[PDB]
């Protein structure tokens, strides 16, 4: 506001309260990491191929 021949600004505090669940989700993922797995079939050499 103009406020008696100046330009004083409003106070804008920040209280972050939405990041806790996101951090929990990220930690839950990083605890149990997953990758790609190849499964064999009903053949003789499919096991060695997948390995």
């Amino acid at each position: 506001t103009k406020l008696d021949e100046q330009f004083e600004k409003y106070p804008k505090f920040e209280i972050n309260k939405v990041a806790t669940e996101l951090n929990r989700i990220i930690a839950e993922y990083r605890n149990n990491r997953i990758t790609v797995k190849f499964r064999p079939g009903d053949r003789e050499a499919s096991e060695e191929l997948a390995n």
Binding site: L3, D4, Q6, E8, K9, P11, K12, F13, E14
Partner: protein, 80 residues
């Protein structure tokens, strides 16, 4: 307003007491002058009151705290 306020002050010399209508007219004129000459100043910040983290200090001109005094306008004259 000036003439009425003067009339009330000088009426004693001729020993004439004032009338309620004259008093009311002088009151209204003085009240109008008072309305014309208002200021109503505002309340500046204390000075140790913190500025919020969302005001982007370290990039904008704002610091962590309000100045609490007229802020510097030039830098050539920095004492005031």
């Amino acid at each position: 307003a000036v003439g009425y306020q003067l009339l009330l002050r000088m009426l004693s010399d001729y020993s004439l007491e004032p009338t309620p209508q004259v008093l009311s007219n002088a009151q209204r004129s003085y009240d109008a002058l008072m309305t014309d000459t208002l200021v109503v100043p505002s309340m500046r910040r204390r000075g140790d009151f913190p500025v919020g983290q969302g005001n982007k200090y370290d990039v904008f001109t704002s610091d962590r705290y309000y100045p609490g005094d007229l802020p510097l306008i030039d830098g050539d004259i920095p004492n005031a």
